[PDB]
C-alpha cells in the first residue's frame, strides 16, 4: 500500500507542477505590455 | 451634475438692429435675478455644492443657466438582498421661497449623453416627477421636481473574490471526515480551516 | 486667480495654477501592466468660435517631476470643434491626452514572489512522507499564510466589477492549486493508513500505477 | 458620393472615399440643449451606424442629404 | 507594509533584507523537507548513494 | 445663509440649514446595550429677554 | 578660449578655464515663454552637452559665439 502511495503521491507532485508553472506562466506573458514592462523597470 | 435653468427676462432686452454683432450678454452672480432652486434633501454641509457661472442672455431675454457641482443627497439603503441589491435614490429640487402662482416651474428631461459608468453600480434610469403640494394658508400649490436614480450593484467583485474562498474553506472543513483517525491530523485541519475563516472574517 | 499682465501693445498674459482633478475611466483589466489614457478638456462656457477663437499651442513638460508609480508617455493635445441645430458658428475646444503606463517593480517583487514561494512550499507537501504527521500541517499552515497575504493583496488592488484583474486570477489559481494539494494529500494519506484485514486495494490502478512506477523509477 | 461632413471647419462637403455611400447625420441634446440646440454629426458610413437611445439618425444615400438644419 | 513606502523607481533597503529573510527561510523549510526524506526511509526498499 | 421672506404685515421667516455637531458626554459603561442624552443649545449671544 | 556665461549677473564675458574650448548657449520654453521668452544658459564646456528633446543647443569653439540674442 505504502509504495503505491508514495508513488501515485510523487504523480500528483508532477501534474500540479506543470499545471502550476504553465499557469503562472501564461497568465504573467497575457498582458500586453507585460513584455515592455520588466524590460523598462527592470 | 450639471443643472440645467431656463427663463424669461422683461427688463433684458435689447433691438440687435442697434448693437450690430452684440448677439449675447453674461452676468455674473449678484448683478442679476436667479432663481432659489436648490436641492430640498442636500447633505454637503454647505448646502449649496454648485459653483456660480455666468448667465448667459440673448435679444429676447431668454436666459440660461448651469451650475454644475459634486451634490450628496439623503437615501435610504436597503441592504437586505446584498450584494444582490437595487437602491432607488432620489433628488427633490424646488423653490426655497416661490410658490407655483410666481415661478411655475417645469420639469423637462434628463440627460445621459455625458454618463461615465464607474464600476461598483449600473444605471437602470433616471425619470423624473414634478409634483406640488398644497397648504392651509391658501389655494395656491407648490411645486417641486424628483429624479429618482435607479441602480444595481455589479456582484463579479463580490463573486469571486468572497464566496469562492468561503465554499473553499467550507469544502476543506468537509473533508475531515475522509482522513483516517490513525494519521493524528483531522483536529489540527479542522481547527487550522476554522481559525482560516476567522482571518477571512477580516476583509469580510 | 493670480494677477493679469499687460504689456504696451495690450498683449495679456495668465497663468492660473491648480491642483485639477478630472473624470477620467480607468481600465484595470491588464492590472499592474495597464497603459491609461486620461484626458483633460478645456474650453469657454459661454462663447463661440465667433467670439472665441481658441488656438492650441503645445504643453509644457520642462518641469515634470516623476513620482515612481507611474511613467509619462506623453500629454499631446487636439483642437476639435463642434457644431449645433441654432447656428453654423462652431464651439472649439482643446483636449490633453495624459498618456501613462504604470511601473511595476513594486507589485513585481512584493506581490508575486511572496505568492510563488507560497505556492512552491504548497506543492512541496507531495515530497514529504506520510510516516511524519506533518504534510496536512504543511498544507493547511500554507493555505492559512496565503489568506493572510490576502489583506495585503486587498488593500493594494482596486475593487471593480467592471472586469477581472490579471493579479485576481493569477492569486484565484494558487488558491485552488493549494487547496486541491490538500485535497490530495488527504486522499493518499486515506491510503497510507489502512488496515489490510479491513480491505483490498482495486486491481485496475494498481497495475497502472505500478507499471507507472517502474518506468519512471527505471 | 458626396457627403457633407463637421471633421472640417467651416463645414465642408467633402467627396467620401469609396465602400462608403451612405451619407449620414447623428443629433443629440448635450447640456446646452436650451440656447444651442441639438449636437450635429455629419459623415459619410460603410453603412449608417448604430443608434444609442438619446441618439437620432436620418441616414441618406443620395448626394449632400445631410446638410446643417439652416440650409 | 504599513510602515514602508510604495515607490516603483527603487528597491528600499529593508526590502532587499526582508526578501533575502524570506528565501533564507524557503529554502530552510525546503532542506528540512529533504532531509527528513532521509530519515524516514525503509532499508529494504532503497539504498543510500556512495559517493 | 438663504434668503428672508417678509409679508406686507412684515412677519419675518427664516431657515438657516446646516450640518450641526455639539458637544455631548456619551456615556459606553452599558456598550452595545446604551441610551444617550444629548442635548443641543440654542440662545442670543448679546441680547436679553427683555430685547 | 573666452566664452559668456550667466552665472554672473550682469551677462559677463569669462575667460574659460583650460579643458573647456568650447562655447555653448542652451535655450527652451518654460511656464513663461508667452511674455519673457525662451531661457537661455551660457557657458563653457569640455565637449558641449546632452540636447534633451525640449532644448536647443547652438554650439561654437571661437570667442564670443555665444552671446545673447539682442546682441
Ligand atoms: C433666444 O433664445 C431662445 C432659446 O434659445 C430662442 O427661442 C427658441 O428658439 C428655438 C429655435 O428657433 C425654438 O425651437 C423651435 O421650437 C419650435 C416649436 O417647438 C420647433 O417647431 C422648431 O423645430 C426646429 O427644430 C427641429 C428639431 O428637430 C427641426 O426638426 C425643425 O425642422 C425646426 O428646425 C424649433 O425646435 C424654441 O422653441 C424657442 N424657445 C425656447 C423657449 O426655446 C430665441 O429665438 C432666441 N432669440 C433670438 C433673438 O435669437
Ligand atoms: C507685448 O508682448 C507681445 C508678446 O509677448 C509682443 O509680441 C510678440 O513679440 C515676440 C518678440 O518680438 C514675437 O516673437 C517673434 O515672432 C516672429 C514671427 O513668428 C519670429 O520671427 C521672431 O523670431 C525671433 O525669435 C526666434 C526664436 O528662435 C529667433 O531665432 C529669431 O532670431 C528672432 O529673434 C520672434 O519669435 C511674437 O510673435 C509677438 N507676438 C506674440 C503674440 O507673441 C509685443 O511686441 C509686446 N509689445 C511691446 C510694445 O513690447
Ligand atoms: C428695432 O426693432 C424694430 C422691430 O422690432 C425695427 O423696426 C427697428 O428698425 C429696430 N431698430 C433699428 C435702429 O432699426
Not at chain 2, 398644497?134 to 424628483?146: L, N
Not at chain 2, 468572497?162 to 493524528?184: E, M, Q, R, T, Y
Not at chain 2, 481547527?191 to 477571512?200: A, E, G
Not at chain 4, 437611445?53 to 448626394?63: G, I, K, M, W
Request: hydrophobic fraction near 40%; glycine fraction near 6%; include cysteine.
Amino acid at each position: 500500500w505504502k509504495f503505491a502511495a508514495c508513488v501515485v503521491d510523487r504523480l500528483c507532485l508532477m501534474a500540479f507542477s506543470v499545471f502550476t508553472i504553465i499557469c503562472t506562466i501564461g497568465i504573467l506573458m497575457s498582458a500586453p505590455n507585460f513584455v515592455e514592462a520588466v524590460s523598462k523597470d527592470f | 451634475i450639471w443643472l440645467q435653468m431656463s427663463w424669461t427676462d422683461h427688463y433684458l432686452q435689447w433691438n440687435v438692429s442697434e448693437y450690430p454683432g452684440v448677439k449675447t450678454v453674461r452676468f455674473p452672480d449678484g448683478q442679476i435675478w436667479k432663481p432659489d432652486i436648490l436641492l430640498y434633501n442636500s447633505a454637503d454641509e454647505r448646502f449649496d455644492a454648485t459653483f456660480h457661472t455666468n448667465v448667459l442672455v440673448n435679444s429676447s431675454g431668454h436666459c440660461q443657466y448651469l451650475p454644475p457641482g459634486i451634490f450628496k443627497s439623503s437615501c435610504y439603503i436597503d441592504v437586505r438582498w446584498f450584494p444582490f441589491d437595487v437602491q432607488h435614490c432620489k433628488l427633490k429640487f424646488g423653490s426655497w421661497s416661490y410658490g407655483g402662482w410666481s415661478l411655475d416651474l417645469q420639469m423637462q428631461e434628463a440627460d445621459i449623453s455625458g454618463y461615465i459608468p464607474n464600476g461598483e453600480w449600473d444605471l437602470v434610469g433616471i425619470p423624473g416627477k414634478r409634483s406640488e403640494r398644497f397648504y392651509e394658508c391658501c389655494k395656491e400649490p407648490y411645486p417641486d421636481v424628483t429624479f429618482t436614480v435607479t441602480m444595481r450593484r455589479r456582484t463579479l467583485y463580490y463573486g469571486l473574490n468572497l464566496l469562492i474562498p468561503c465554499v473553499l474553506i467550507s469544502a476543506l472543513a468537509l473533508l475531515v471526515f475522509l482522513l483516517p483517525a490513525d494519521s493524528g491530523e483531522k483536529i489540527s485541519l479542522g481547527i487550522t480551516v476554522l481559525l482560516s475563516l476567522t482571518v477571512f472574517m477580516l476583509l469580510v | 486667480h493670480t494677477n493679469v499682465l499687460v504689456n504696451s501693445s495690450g498683449h495679456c498674459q495668465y497663468l492660473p495654477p491648480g491642483i485639477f482633478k478630472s473624470s477620467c475611466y480607468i481600465d484595470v483589466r491588464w492590472f499592474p501592466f495597464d497603459v491609461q489614457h486620461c484626458k483633460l478638456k478645456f474650453g469657454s462656457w459661454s462663447y463661440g468660435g465667433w467670439s472665441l477663437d481658441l488656438q492650441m499651442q503645445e504643453a509644457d513638460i520642462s518641469g515634470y517631476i516623476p513620482n515612481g508609480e507611474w511613467d509619462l508617455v506623453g500629454i499631446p493635445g487636439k483642437r476639435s470643434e463642434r457644431f449645433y441645430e441654432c447656428c453654423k458658428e462652431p464651439y472649439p475646444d482643446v483636449t490633453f491626452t495624459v498618456t501613462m503606463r504604470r511601473r511595476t517593480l513594486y507589485y513585481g517583487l512584493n506581490l508575486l514572489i511572496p505568492c510563488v514561494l507560497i505556492s512552491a512550499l504548497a506543492l512541496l507537501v507531495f515530497l514529504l512522507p506520510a510516516d511524519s504527521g506533518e504534510k496536512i500541517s504543511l498544507g493547511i499552515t500554507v493555505l492559512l499564510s496565503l489568506t493572510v497575504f490576502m489583506l495585503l493583496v486587498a488593500e493594494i488592488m482596486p475593487a471593480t466589477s467592471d472586469s477581472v484583474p490579471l493579479i485576481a486570477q493569477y492569486f484565484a489559481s494558487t488558491m485552488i492549486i493549494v487547496g486541491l494539494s490538500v485535497v490530495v494529500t488527504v486522499i493518499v494519506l486515506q491510503y497510507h493508513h489502512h488496515d489490510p484485514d479491513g480491505g483490498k486495494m482495486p486491481k485496475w490502478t494498481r497495475v497502472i500505477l505500478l507499471n507507472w512506477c517502474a518506468w519512471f523509477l527505471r | 458620393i458626396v457627403c457633407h461632413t463637421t471633421a472640417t471647419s467651416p463645414i465642408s462637403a467633402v467627396t467620401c472615399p469609396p465602400g462608403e455611400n451612405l451619407c449620414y447625420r447623428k443629433m443629440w441634446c448635450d447640456v446646452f440643449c436650451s440656447s444651442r440646440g441639438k449636437v450635429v454629426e455629419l459623415g459619410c458610413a460603410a453603412t449608417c451606424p448604430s443608434k444609442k437611445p438619446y441618439e437620432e439618425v436620418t441616414c441618406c444615400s443620395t448626394d449632400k442629404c445631410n446638410p446643417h438644419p439652416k440650409q
